[PDB]
Design a protein around this ligand. Structure first.
Ligand SMILES: NC(=O)c1ccc[n+]([C@@H]2O[C@H](COP(=O)([O-])OP(=O)(O)OC[C@H]3O[C@@H](n4cnc5c(N)ncnc54)[C@H](O)[C@@H]3O)[C@@H](O)[C@H]2O)c1
Ligand SMILES: NC(=O)c1ccc[n+]([C@@H]2O[C@H](COP(=O)([O-])OP(=O)(O)OC[C@H]3O[C@@H](n4cnc5c(N)ncnc54)[C@H](O)[C@@H]3O)[C@@H](O)[C@H]2O)c1
Ligand SMILES: NC(=O)c1ccc[n+]([C@@H]2O[C@H](COP(=O)([O-])OP(=O)(O)OC[C@H]3O[C@@H](n4cnc5c(N)ncnc54)[C@H](O)[C@@H]3O)[C@@H](O)[C@H]2O)c1
Ligand SMILES: NC(=O)c1ccc[n+]([C@@H]2O[C@H](COP(=O)([O-])OP(=O)(O)OC[C@H]3O[C@@H](n4cnc5c(N)ncnc54)[C@H](O)[C@@H]3O)[C@@H](O)[C@H]2O)c1
Lengths: 246, 257, 246, 257
């Protein structure tokens, strides 16, 4: 496995449908040792169960709204691990009412603030707090984005602005940390209900992508095989974004 | 002029170095009738004076931190104008300390929040509040962005994230309002010496570097940005929406120069 | 008119449906003085008629396959004009059989060569030959491209490669000539038969663009109003390219 | 390895400095079985020797100027392999004189034609000729591009146009073959000291500049490019097609550094 020896912290795994679960599974198959965060105490048992199945008992509460909690994750993780080789950002949130219907009607200041804070600021926040553990290790950060960053899409609305902020965050983080041996890259994943049918009917592959396909791309981006790649957004959408008038 | 009789609301004009002043002047030269906002009471006299020189006495206070103030602008403007043909977003802010040195060291939650709220959310916020006055008119919105949206750049730091959010905001606003006959476009301007620009550490170096490295071998002017905005606000650009146009003398498309 | 005093050479005007005609009309409405090329002697009378309606009697034969003919246009034009303020490239060609069906089946070496030579090399070829007349005048070049440069599109096939070469040509020409006061920009126009219905149903404006809308954008890019813009591809497609999953 | 038993044809390997050698080595480390092409008879011995070290004795002459030769490669390869899982395009050329100084002065019709034919048409030409052997296998194609596709760069000149054509070729090939289970992706590599690179005037300056200005503060290696290619040739990347991946240490996304 090309992640043998790599210690990787994975955020956002709340079920076996999660993109973060696909990533966790892919990484574990390549020999990585894993740790996980969970947003609220309600989910602890569920995440520990999933973690145990991936041979891990390193599970920490982390609401990225809280600087204290973010920093506490690494303080706790540092008691088990000498350093951190991989960091997976697979976290996004916006109020449901902002993700429906007319873009301007659905938007509000508070929804904008929440979306950006949780979905975009969380990348640099986590990179900043992880920096002591990651620097000098030839380590890597991977974050999940979506086509809404660069195209107007129905319903995605304010989340598109937040993903754009995120992708820029990826570039600035990469430029910031490259000299000290930390890479930062993004994956823009295809959708994973009629929207699914649209993508599958319109993309070069004529099908939707899987969490395994996203997961394997993340595993690659977290490994030394991708050591020449930083500040990149890789599209795992079966070529959807590069097709038009299909 | 190609904006003859078009009614245009311009934000962000605080001096004759302002990009918004360049835009205002360009629009007025093409026959537009103008109105202006100003962020705080301390600037009112200055902005009224500048407005008067551009043949306008429609001036309104607007801190885009405040939904009350944003919406009040259009309630007040509506007493004078039956509709609005143009809206110019030329507003940005981030705490100075976040715009200097190492990206992660300089960033904070609060600075991120402020930068995005003032510099990015303000676009849809203004479009939303202007929508009743603009819809059904073949009207247009223009906002100012910067290369930090799409490239990592020293010192610009968290503002780059905010500009990226803004540019996506431009696309989503365009997609949202196109059916109602309102267009929304961006201009990514090259560096220009303005009050806000002096907030960025080592700005004079960015300016010197661009002039030495762009195809035109010089920096752009507020007039050049202004004329591009005037075009994007006019019916001449009626086939263009959701676009970011680079007015940077070709800097962004050059490398290893 | 914002093109008063501007002398502009326009290629590719073969009918009043031509994008080049829209450009010519738009430019003339803003006060420009025009000249025209035509590819073959068969079209001379038609183009002279159109030119006369746009108040011009400066019409020259030019097959861009021929260096001699390209250079001869400027030798002849130079007897009437002191300099050249605007150059409009609105020329594209590929064999019809390469523009239908499966991309690889439809392609051939000869079709590729022809498409690129006529549709892409013609930009630098014309810029090169115009350079003595255009330099130091604060002049401008505009070329027409299409979404096939940057997206895979059905049927457009090898022309997509040629347009990509063209757009890169625009950037390299802009970088080359900027110091001597010549700008070079592109317009990526929307389509102008079911494809039309698709774009009109899917773009932000919910309609197709007109030759007038393309023409006015060209007029702007040829004027001093756009003096801060070079090496740019401006999309006049009603926002189609920036929309997805619509 | 993640390419265990995958059969991969590699073009463009003429020395151990070649990007194609880096790719070949990376693929072989992951269990792939390899075959190689060489442009002229004068290089045959060298390429056979290199191939033998990568456990291969499948070596074929192919000048991509010739449709006969391109198609003959697959006719000959088909005697040994029942199908093809991977195809690597690592070939480029333009006359030296077109790669030096002023873009327009240096360009000519003939140089343009040659550059595009050898460097861009060769991708679809090879994909087309490989199609019967590759279809229905979940196979993959990888081609090498450079930043000149999307930025104006000194000296690269007409090659930039050719690389742009190539990248569009990658997208069109991907859209064409996806239904048959063949993927097609590109790698835009940072500058690397190779035989072909020495064709570009002032290449050593491009190399020095990139290392001083990219996020990683160093140039990339053929191993880094090679491992990315191996990934793109494998089932691990089965969700990726029509993509240009930048292996340049983040150079293209940095500005004003
Ligand atoms: N599924 C898709 O179609 C798709 C496509 C592209 C990108 N993405 C992105 O991938 C990422 C993962 O989403 P998913 O599709 O696996 O959905 P998911 O619900 O499985 O995962 C989203 C995760 O974000 C976490 N989260 C939300 N608020 C948080 C907070 N305050 N602190 C910490 N964690 C918080 C949730 O707990 C959840 O585990 C998201 O960033 C999403 O935008 C998803
Ligand atoms: N000058 C440059 O180099 C440059 C380049 C590209 C883009 N821009 C952008 O152009 C726009 C205008 O900036 P400028 O360069 O003319 O500087 P400027 O200082 O003249 O204008 C900035 C304006 O933003 C306004 N503003 C700040 N906070 C506000 C708030 N809470 N409410 C309302 N208004 C507020 C200021 O009052 C000021 O009028 C900004 O979006 C900036 O990011 C500037
Ligand atoms: N109509 C569209 O949908 C559309 C959209 C985007 C871009 N474009 C581009 O706009 C340009 C103009 O095309 P159009 O749509 O007006 O079609 P058109 O047929 O009106 O114009 C194409 C012109 O190219 C000229 N041409 C062809 N071969 C030539 C040669 N060897 N020498 C000189 N001239 C030659 C033709 O004579 C013709 O006048 C083309 O480059 C085209 O690709 C068209
Ligand atoms: N070295 C770099 O800095 C760099 C960076 C990005 C991309 N690239 C690209 O990588 C690819 C490989 O180049 P490299 O850097 O390994 O140089 P190289 O000299 O090792 O390889 C170039 C190859 O192209 C082959 N070639 C040239 N003309 C040919 C023809 N008519 N038929 C068949 N093959 C032919 C040569 O024989 C040689 O094997 C090229 O596409 C190049 O443009 C190189």
């Amino acid at each position: 496995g090309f992640l043998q020896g790599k210690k990787i912290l994975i955020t956002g795994m709340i079920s076996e449908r999660s993109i973060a679960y696909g990533i966790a599974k892919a990484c574990r198959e390549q020999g990585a040792e894993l740790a996980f965060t969970y947003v609220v105490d309600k989910l602890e048992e569920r995440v520990r169960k999933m973690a145990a199945e991936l041979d891990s008992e390193l599970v920490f509460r982390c609401d990225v709204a809280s600087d204290d909690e973010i920093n506490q994750v690494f303080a706790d993780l540092g008691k088990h691990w000498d350093g951190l080789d991989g960091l997976v950002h697979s976290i996004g949130f916006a109020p449901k009412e902002a993700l429906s219907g007319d873009f301007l009607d659905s938007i509000s200041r508070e929804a904008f603030n929440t979306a950006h804070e949780i979905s975009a600021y969380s990348l640099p926040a986590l990179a900043k707090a992880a920096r002591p553990m990651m620097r000098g290790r030839n380590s890597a950060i991977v974050a999940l984005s979506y086509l809404g960053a660069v195209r107007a899409i129905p319903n995605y609305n304010v989340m598109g602005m937040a993903k754009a902020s995120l992708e820029a965050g990826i570039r600035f983080t990469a430029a910031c940390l490259g000299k000290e041996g930390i890479r930062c890259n993004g994956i823009s994943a295809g959708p994973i209900g009629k929207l699914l049918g649209h993508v599958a009917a319109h993309n070069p592959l004529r099908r939707n992508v899987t969490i395994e396909e996203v997961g394997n791309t993340a595993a690659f981006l977290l490994s030394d095989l991708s050591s020449g790649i930083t500040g990149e957004i890789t599209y795992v959408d079966g070529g959807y974004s590069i097709n038009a008038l299909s």
